[PDB]
From Swiss-Prot, chains A, B:
It comes from Homo sapiens. The keyword RNA-binding does not apply. Signal peptide: none annotated. It is an enzyme of class 2 (transferase). SUPFAM superfamilies: Nucleotide-diphospho-sugar transferases (SSF53448). Keywords: Disease variant, Disulfide bond, Glycoprotein, Glycosyltransferase, Golgi apparatus, Hereditary spastic paraplegia, Lipid metabolism, Membrane, Neurodegeneration, Signal-anchor, Sphingolipid metabolism, Transferase, Transmembrane, Transmembrane helix. Homodimer; disulfide-linked. The gene is B4GALNT1. Glycans are attached at residues 29, 129, 218. Disulfide bonds join 373-420. This is Beta-1,4 N-acetylgalactosaminyltransferase 1. The lineage of its organism: Eukaryota, Metazoa, Chordata, Craniata, Vertebrata.
């Protein structure tokens, strides 16, 4: 909750609230409301609310809400870092120190930058006390006249009859991580008489750079095409034929959970057979797991490559921008094309209820330098993406049936999504064993749990 | 990199270098050297060096080093943040401000905590300037007598004849992210006459919590067993039989790239058929892509569950500790068991050469509260792990033949690994087509590129 109330220190100062601004803050009170029903108005779009709590019996719901709270608290505990703690720099300290930007790998050692004591010259003695909790301090060299206590310990003191001596000594302080952890931080204390500063040294490994060999744009080397089929071999073969018309050696990975699978083969085609009805997002997951190239192109099995499906153009966007995923446009026989550019946002709910997801059509802004391309949160099922980022988000195998934006919501904030309308694929002009209704309730329960959601509006 | 040379300000101050401490710093000069050959001596362990550069013609090497540098620079550019920049807090400033811990979601708004001006009373006027680059400032409420300039702009000024007024006004300052980005930061300027502070607001989404229903421990709900087989149906059936003796309803996912696949079926078994020789790590990747449970158990197809193979115990470690992956022990028919606890570290090499990997047997420290369990970097191919972390690291499908520790190296720093000797699986007492030596050269070139490695020592 944002606290607008005056501390007693300033209760005597009058303040007129800006409603306009207080409205921008997080009030942790979200809900999901439907558009008034009836005949729709021009310009206005109809908003439909889903109450995810209605996917459970209220008895079950209380159980779910409890176990979900427990799992969330667990999640917090594993994920949160001393570097995420709110630290306020004090005013009017002699203490100069690094506030951010200081990092060491577990069990290694660094010179600490920018440590200094800017006090008054003349004072008989000058002393600074450094405290760590996951490391130890030492000096790269000893300054004549500075006395050190606790070299190679968690607590170091430096004391000097000369201020220039002390400061030069500080320029040489080293920090060492003592115990192995993968990704954490030490909140160190730098102090002198009547003054205290807290700062954080991050203890972590450099990230896996996951560098791919370019091996201009070699599409066969850079891109693998991934799809999932179920009992639609005609569409699938028509797709592969259409791909081969423009890209003869690009790999096509096909996941398939058909009951009696047909043989799918040809040069540069890889067929994966799954247990019957394992599902949609699982085949998506399977297909992506097999990609060896920097990039993966998702297409549905009922799509058809044209001359408008210029993958070079998508490759270009990913090569030249920080995007992770860039969607094309899928065009009907009717000549209408969609980019299905979607915005997803999660809004904070009351404590223990969970959050509210808002989906609405749209985008954030135009992608500078690339006309017809925008940045949004979700796109249609025709996209090129960095294989690694896709795998990193995943196609949750639990979504066995009806699912699309759930990938983009799993990816929310982690995946940098764009959408280009000029790269176009065609959509070609008994299929679900069991209760769709069940699958839907199942999905709602899953989304409720997995994302801590109470409800959602679709728009 | 380390500069120990004095700025002219202190060149006149004598310093005696501590060799033992300067020795702890990164000198960016690593190499990989073999133990002297000849007959081994009883206490020494033999260290073998691989020069990864030798896996290429001088032509190929120059090409790959260039391309690798390019891809690395790209990687840096997409990954690095203003929040990683070194900031030094100045001494003797009246400016109090948040040094870390302040974060807003893209396009959202927060009260900035801890802003104030601790100047002395008695001045005729007090003014502060706030500057942002990816956001704008406003106030939640207006203090009588404080003049605001730039409300809703990147630059805000607060001017006041009263210091208490200014500070109350500061308590109400709000920051708003203006442009949509997924994970970045704004470095703000807080300023008053003759004084400047820099601090960073992180602009990012809260992470996907990825909560699992628990469903003591329901192993069928929590754990899926994953394996990969190739023409070893007898071992595989022996494995499934052995599992079913202790765990009748735990799902077993089997990836299989046999040329002539046999039927593998029975309750709770899922068989995945792959193109012949698609490979080792790919089947591993495939199997994990199909796991729907919080946890996955990796077992080789030649393993055999006994009464020692008590998964509850592994489940327990992951439920009660921040580990992501916990390896068991694999016992030979000879009665010897291995946990294959491995340490991997990357050491900085000279500019443009790449880094050195050191693998050595060992662990970091004992896992407090769990006798016989340790924290290490790599383990044997019997382990329970959080599915999501396994998928996040990946079994690179390019490792089609011989690979094991490459998963742990891909995960290095990202995966919290442990190993318990008391959970024990038996190893039972038609090889891949192609050239081993080719695969090995291939893998060397891959590791050279992928991980920016020049060389490695095995120990
Ligand atoms: C663009 O990338 C593709 C894919 O990486 C390159 O094609 C691949 O090139 C290698 C040779 O550099 C081929 O390997 C050869 O395979 C045959 C067996 O098929 C074997 O007899 C040879 O000894 C050799 O290993 C590989 O087959 C080939 N793959 C494809 C998709 O055809 C391609 O050269 C790159 N450049 C351009 C400009 O296309
Ligand atoms: C431990 O976790 C497993 C997870 O599979 C639990 O078993 C599963 O429980 C669900 C819900 O009760 C069963 O669903 C039902 O299946 C029948 C058909 O088999 C169907 O008619 C119902 O509409 C419903 O979908 C699911 O089959 C079952 N899976 C099995 C038996 O392996 C198991 O109950 C948990 N154990 C305990 C004691 O908590
Ligand atoms: O098993 C599937 C196949 C597709 N889709 C989604 O539905 C779209 C396809 O819609 P269409 O009306 O073309 O149905 P189709 O007959 O092509 O499956 C895809 O883009 C997916 O996002 C789904 O949820 N499950
Ligand atoms: O296709 C494969 C199968 C296994 N392994 C690795 O080799 C070990 C198995 O060694 P073993 O001597 O038991 O050989 P196996 O005949 O069991 O494959 C595993 O634990 C894996 O890490 C591999 O590199 N490639
Ligand atoms: Mn369709
Ligand atoms: Mn074996």
């Amino acid at each position: 909750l944002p606290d607008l109330a005056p501390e007693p220190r300033y209760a005597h100062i009058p303040v007129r609230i800006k409603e306009q601004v207080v409205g921008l803050l997080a009030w942790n009170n979200c809900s999901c409301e439907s558009s008034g029903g009836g005949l729709p108005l021009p310009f206005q779009k109809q908003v439909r609310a889903i109450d995810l709590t209605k996917a459970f019996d209220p008895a079950e719901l209380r159980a779910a809400s409890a176990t979900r709270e427990q799992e969330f608290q667990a999640f917090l505990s594993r994920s949160q870092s001393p570097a995420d703690q709110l630290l306020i720099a004090p005013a009017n300290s002699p203490l100069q120190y690094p506030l951010q930007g200081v990092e060491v790998q577990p069990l290694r050692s660094i010179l600490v930058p920018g440590l200094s004591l800017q006090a008054a010259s003349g004072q008989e003695v000058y002393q600074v006390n450094l405290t760590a909790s996951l490391g130890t301090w030492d000096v790269a060299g000893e300054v004549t006249g500075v006395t050190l206590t606790g070299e190679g310990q968690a607590d170091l003191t430096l004391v000097s009859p000369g201020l220039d001596q002390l400061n030069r000594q500080l320029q040489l302080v080293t920090y060492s991580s003592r115990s192995y952890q993968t990704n954490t931080a030490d909140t160190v204390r730098f102090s002198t008489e009547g003054h205290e500063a807290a700062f954080t040294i991050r203890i972590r490994h450099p990230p896996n750079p996951r560098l791919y060999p370019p091996g201009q744009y070699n599409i066969s080397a850079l891109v693998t095409i991934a799809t999932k089929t179920f009992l639609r071999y005609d569409r699938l073969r028509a797709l592969i034929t259409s791909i081969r018309r423009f890209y003869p050696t690009v790999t096509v990975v096909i996941a398939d959970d058909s009951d009696k699978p047909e043989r799918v083969s040809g040069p540069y085609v890889e067929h994966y057979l799954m247990p019957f009805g394992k599902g949609w997002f699982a085949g998506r997951n399977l297909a992506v797991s097999q990609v060896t190239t920097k990039y993966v192109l998702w297409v549905d099995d009922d799509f058809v490559f044209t001359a408008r499906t210029r993958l070079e153009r998508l490759v270009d966007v990913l090569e030249r921008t920080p995007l992770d995923l860039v969607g094309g446009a899928v065009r009907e026989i009717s000549g209408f094309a969609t980019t299905y550019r979607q915005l997803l946002s999660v809004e904070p709910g009351a404590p223990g209820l969970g959050n509210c997801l808002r989906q609405r059509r749209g985008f954030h802004h135009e992608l500078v330098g690339f006309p017809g391309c925008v940045v949004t949160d979700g796109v249609v099922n025709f996209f090129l993406a960095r294989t690694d980022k896709v795998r990193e988000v995943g196609f949750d195998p639990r979504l066995s049936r009806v699912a699309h934006l759930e990938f983009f919501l799993d990816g929310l904030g982690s995946l940098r999504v764009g959408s280009c309308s000029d790269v176009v694929v065609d959509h070609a002009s008994y299929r679900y064993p069991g209760s769709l209704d069940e699958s839907q309730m199942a999905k709602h329960r899953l989304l409720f749990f997995k994302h801590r959601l109470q409800c959602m509006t679709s728009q």
